[PDB]
PDB file of C-alpha atoms in Angstrom:
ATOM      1  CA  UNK S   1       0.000   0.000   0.000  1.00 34.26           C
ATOM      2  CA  UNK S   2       0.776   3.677  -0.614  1.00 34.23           C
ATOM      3  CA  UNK S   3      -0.472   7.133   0.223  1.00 36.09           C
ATOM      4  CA  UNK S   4      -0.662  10.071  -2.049  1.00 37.25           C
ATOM      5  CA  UNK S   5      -1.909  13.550  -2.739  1.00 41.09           C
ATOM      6  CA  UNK S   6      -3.743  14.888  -5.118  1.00 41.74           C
ATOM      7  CA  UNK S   7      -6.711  17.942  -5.047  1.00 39.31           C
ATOM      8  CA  UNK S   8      -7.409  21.648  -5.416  1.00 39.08           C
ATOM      9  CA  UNK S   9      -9.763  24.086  -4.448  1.00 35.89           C
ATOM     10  CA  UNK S  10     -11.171  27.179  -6.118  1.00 32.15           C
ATOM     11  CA  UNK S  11     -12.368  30.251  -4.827  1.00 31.98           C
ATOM     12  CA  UNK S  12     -15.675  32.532  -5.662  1.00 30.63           C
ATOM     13  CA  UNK S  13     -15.607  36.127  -5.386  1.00 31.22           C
ATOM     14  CA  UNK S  14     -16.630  38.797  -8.078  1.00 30.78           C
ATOM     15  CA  UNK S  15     -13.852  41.289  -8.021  1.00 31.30           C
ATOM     16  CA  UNK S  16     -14.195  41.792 -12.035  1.00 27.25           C
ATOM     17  CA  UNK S  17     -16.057  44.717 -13.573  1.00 26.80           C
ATOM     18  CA  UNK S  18     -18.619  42.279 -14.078  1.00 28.13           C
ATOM     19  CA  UNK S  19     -21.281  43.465 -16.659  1.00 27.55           C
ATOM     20  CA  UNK S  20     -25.008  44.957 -14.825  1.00 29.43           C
ATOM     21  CA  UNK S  21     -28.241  42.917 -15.186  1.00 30.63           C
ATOM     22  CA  UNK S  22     -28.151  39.923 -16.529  1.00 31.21           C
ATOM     23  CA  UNK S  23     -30.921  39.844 -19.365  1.00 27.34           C
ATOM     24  CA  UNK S  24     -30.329  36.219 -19.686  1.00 23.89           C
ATOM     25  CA  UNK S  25     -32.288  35.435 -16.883  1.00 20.42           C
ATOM     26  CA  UNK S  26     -35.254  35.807 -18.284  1.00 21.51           C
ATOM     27  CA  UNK S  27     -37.248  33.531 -20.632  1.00 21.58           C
ATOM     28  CA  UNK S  28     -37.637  35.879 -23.382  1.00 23.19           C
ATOM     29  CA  UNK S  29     -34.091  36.517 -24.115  1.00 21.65           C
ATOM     30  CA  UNK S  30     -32.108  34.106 -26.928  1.00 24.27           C
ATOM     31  CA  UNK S  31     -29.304  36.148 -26.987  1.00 23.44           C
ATOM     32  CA  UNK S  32     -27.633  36.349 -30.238  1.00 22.00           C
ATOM     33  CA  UNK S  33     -30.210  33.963 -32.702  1.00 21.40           C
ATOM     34  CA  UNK S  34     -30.705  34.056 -35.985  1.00 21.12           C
ATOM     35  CA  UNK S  35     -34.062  34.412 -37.592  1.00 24.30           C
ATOM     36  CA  UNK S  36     -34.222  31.037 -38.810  1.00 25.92           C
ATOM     37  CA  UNK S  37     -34.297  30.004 -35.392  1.00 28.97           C
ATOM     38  CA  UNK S  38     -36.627  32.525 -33.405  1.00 28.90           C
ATOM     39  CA  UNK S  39     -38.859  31.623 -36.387  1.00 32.63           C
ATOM     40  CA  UNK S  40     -38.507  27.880 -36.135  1.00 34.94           C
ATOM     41  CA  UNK S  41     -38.882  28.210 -32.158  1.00 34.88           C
ATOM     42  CA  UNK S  42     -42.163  30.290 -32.261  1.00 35.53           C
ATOM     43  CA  UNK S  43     -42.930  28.213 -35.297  1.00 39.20           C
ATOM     44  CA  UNK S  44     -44.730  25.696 -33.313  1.00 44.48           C
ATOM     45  CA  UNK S  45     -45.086  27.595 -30.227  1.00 42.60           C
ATOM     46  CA  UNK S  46     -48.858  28.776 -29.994  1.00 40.78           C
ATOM     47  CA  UNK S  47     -49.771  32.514 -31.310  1.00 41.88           C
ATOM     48  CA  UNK S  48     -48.235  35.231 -28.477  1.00 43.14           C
ATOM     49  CA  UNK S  49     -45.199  33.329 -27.757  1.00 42.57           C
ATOM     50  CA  UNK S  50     -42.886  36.629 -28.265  1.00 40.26           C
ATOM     51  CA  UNK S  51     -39.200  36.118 -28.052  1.00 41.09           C
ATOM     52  CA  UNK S  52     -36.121  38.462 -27.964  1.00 41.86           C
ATOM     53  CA  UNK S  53     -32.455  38.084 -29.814  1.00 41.42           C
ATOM     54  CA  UNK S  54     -29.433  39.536 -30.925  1.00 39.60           C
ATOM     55  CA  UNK S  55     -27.830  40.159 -34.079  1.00 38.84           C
ATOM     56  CA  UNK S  56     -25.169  37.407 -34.152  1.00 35.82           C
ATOM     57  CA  UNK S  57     -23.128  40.104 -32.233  1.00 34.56           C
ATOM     58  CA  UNK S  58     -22.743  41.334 -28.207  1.00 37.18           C
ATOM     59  CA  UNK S  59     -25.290  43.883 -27.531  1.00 36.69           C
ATOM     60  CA  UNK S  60     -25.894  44.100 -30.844  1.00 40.98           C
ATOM     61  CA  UNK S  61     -29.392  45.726 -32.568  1.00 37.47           C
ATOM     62  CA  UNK S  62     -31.927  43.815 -30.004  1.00 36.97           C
ATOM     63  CA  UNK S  63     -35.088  42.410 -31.857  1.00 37.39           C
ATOM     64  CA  UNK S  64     -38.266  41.114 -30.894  1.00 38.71           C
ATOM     65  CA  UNK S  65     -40.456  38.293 -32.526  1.00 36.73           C
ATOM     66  CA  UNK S  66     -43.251  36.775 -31.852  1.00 36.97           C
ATOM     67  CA  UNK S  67     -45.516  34.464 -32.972  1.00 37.07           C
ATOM     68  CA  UNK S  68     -48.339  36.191 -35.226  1.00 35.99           C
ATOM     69  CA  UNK S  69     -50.902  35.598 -37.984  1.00 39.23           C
ATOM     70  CA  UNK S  70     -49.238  32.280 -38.119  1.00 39.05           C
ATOM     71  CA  UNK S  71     -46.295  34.066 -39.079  1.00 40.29           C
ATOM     72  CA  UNK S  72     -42.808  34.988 -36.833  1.00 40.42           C
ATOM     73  CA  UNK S  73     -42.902  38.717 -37.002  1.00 41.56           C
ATOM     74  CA  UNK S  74     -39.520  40.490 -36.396  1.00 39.95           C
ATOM     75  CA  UNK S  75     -39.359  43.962 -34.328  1.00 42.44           C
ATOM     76  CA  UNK S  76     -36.052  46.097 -34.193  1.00 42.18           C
ATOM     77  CA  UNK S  77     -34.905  47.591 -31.210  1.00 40.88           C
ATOM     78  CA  UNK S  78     -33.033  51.152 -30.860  1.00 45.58           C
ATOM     79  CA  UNK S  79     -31.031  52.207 -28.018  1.00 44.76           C
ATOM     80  CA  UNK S  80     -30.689  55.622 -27.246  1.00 44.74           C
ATOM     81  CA  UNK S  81     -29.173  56.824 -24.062  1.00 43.36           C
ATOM     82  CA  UNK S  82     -28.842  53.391 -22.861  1.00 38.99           C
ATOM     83  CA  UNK S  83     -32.409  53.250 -22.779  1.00 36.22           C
ATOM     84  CA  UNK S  84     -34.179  50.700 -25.241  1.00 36.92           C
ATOM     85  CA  UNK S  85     -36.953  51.163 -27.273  1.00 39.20           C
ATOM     86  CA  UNK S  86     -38.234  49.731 -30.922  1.00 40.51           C
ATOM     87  CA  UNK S  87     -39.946  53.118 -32.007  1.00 40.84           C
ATOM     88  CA  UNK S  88     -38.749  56.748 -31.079  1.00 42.33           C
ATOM     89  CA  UNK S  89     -42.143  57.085 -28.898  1.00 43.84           C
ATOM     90  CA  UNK S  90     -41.349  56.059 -25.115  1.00 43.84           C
ATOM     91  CA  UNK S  91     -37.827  54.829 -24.184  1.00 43.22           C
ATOM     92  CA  UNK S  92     -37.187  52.576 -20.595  1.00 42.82           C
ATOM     93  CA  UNK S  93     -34.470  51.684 -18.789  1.00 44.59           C
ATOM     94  CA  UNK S  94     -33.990  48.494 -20.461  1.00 44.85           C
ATOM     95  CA  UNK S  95     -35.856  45.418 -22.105  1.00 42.62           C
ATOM     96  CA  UNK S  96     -37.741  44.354 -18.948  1.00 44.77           C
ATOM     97  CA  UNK S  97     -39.187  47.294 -18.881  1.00 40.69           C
ATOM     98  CA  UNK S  98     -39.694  48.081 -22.767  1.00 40.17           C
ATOM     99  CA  UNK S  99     -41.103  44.782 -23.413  1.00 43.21           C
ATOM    100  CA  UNK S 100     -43.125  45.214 -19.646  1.00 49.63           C
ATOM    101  CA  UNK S 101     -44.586  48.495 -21.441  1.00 49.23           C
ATOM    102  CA  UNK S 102     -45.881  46.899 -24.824  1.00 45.39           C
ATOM    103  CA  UNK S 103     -46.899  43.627 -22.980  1.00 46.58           C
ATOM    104  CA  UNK S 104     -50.003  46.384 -22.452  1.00 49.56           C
ATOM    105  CA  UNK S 105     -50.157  48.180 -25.758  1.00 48.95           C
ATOM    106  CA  UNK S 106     -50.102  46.677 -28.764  1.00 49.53           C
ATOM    107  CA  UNK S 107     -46.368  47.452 -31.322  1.00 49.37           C
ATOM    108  CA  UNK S 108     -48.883  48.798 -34.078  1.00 50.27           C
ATOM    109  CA  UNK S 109     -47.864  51.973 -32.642  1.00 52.46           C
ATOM    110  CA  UNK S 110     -44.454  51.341 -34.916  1.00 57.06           C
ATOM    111  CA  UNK S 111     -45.742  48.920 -37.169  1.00 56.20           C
ATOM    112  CA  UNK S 112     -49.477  49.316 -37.618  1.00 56.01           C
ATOM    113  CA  UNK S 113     -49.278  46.178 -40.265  1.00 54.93           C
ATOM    114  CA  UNK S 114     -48.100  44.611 -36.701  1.00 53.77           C
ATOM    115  CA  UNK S 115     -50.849  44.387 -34.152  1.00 51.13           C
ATOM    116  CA  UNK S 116     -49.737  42.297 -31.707  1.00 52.04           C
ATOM    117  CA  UNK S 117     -48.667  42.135 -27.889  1.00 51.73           C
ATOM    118  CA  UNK S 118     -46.218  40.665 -25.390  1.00 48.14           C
ATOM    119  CA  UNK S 119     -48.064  37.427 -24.180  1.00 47.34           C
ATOM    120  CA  UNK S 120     -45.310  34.823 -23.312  1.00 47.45           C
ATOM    121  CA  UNK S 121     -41.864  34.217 -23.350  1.00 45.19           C
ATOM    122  CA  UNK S 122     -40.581  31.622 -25.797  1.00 43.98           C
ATOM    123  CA  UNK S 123     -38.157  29.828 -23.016  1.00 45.13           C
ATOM    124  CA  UNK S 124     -41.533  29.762 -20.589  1.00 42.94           C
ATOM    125  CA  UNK S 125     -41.917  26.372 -19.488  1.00 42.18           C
ATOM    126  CA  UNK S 126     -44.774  24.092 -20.624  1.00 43.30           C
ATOM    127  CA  UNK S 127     -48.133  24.977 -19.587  1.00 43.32           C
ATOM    128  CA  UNK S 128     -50.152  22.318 -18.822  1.00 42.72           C
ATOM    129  CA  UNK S 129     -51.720  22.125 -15.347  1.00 44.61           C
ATOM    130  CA  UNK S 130     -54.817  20.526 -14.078  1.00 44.61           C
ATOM    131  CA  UNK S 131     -55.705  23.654 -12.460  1.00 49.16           C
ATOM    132  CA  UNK S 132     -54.032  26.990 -12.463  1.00 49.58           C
ATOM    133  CA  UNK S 133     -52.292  29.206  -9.534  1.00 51.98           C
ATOM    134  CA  UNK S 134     -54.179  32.515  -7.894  1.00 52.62           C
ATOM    135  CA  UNK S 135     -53.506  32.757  -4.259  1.00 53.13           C
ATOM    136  CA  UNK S 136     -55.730  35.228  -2.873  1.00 52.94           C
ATOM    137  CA  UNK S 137     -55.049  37.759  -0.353  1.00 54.38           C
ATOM    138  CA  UNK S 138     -58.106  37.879   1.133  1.00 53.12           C
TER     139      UNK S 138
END
């Protein structure tokens, strides 16, 4: 018999100028996809399921499409300011927000051809559930 030694350890601790928000954390974010994709994703999905990507490129022109008219519409995305917004009309902080905003009002305001709305992410999870959640508070 004979001993030996062998191992390391690692450490954790952000001291990097690590970048702000992650937008990756949420569902409708593909980072940088190419239509093909977004339009073979929402392809099937059912009508609603909006999705946001990249152009092939970091922080590149954001765009948003969804699933419409049987059809995976495209929106682009301008940046002013830092602020992000498809039409010169309302800016926001950043997507969350901007895509929070139109998830009430339809995008015909900058494509009136295009009258749809945020419904659902195209990363949300399947949705089948005997019955649905609504705690009330009572």
């Amino acid at each position: 018999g004979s001993s030996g030694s062998s191992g390391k350890a690692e450490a954790e601790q952000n001291w990097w100028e690590g970048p702000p928000q992650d937008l990756s954390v949420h569902l409708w974010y593909a980072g940088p996809m190419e239509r093909a994709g977004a339009e073979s994703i929402l392809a099937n999905r059912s009508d609603g399921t909006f999705l946001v990507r990249q152009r092939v490129k970091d922080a590149a022109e954001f765009a948003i499409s969804i699933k419409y008219n049987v059809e995976v519409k495209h929106i682009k995305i301008m940046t002013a300011e830092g602020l992000y917004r498809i039409t010169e009309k309302k800016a926001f902080r950043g997507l969350t927000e901007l895509v929070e905003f139109y998830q009430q009002n339809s995008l015909k305001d900058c494509f009136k051809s295009l009258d749809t709305t945020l419904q659902f992410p195209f990363k949300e999870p399947e949705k089948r559930t005997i019955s649905r959640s609504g705690p009330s508070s009572g």
